[PDB]
Design a protein around this ligand. Structure first.
Ligand SMILES: [Cl-]
Lengths: 27, 30, 30, 27
């Protein structure tokens, strides 16, 4: 359960950043 | 039109709620 | 241990809730 | 607002499929 929790934090941050970018580019 | 504007506004609002829900979840749980 | 098991179970449950919430949202709104 | 709504359906389906895969692979 070590670096996988850290790996999860990074994927979730990336997922939200992507979603925000998509929204702004559309409007 | 008219209903096209309403559906577009509804879809925008729902996506804004999706972002806010994801942000809250990330900040509280990580 | 003990609290390691509880936190692991909690994290698993939360991820299961994340999936169910996303599925519901997809099916109802698309 | 044409094919972008269709484009959104496909990204969301892909996002859920990915999340389910990640969960199953972990346990
Ligand atoms: Cl997502």
């Amino acid at each position: 359960f070590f670096r996988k929790s850290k790996e999860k934090i990074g994927k979730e941050f990336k997922r939200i950043v992507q979603r925000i970018k998509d929204f702004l580019r559309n409007l």
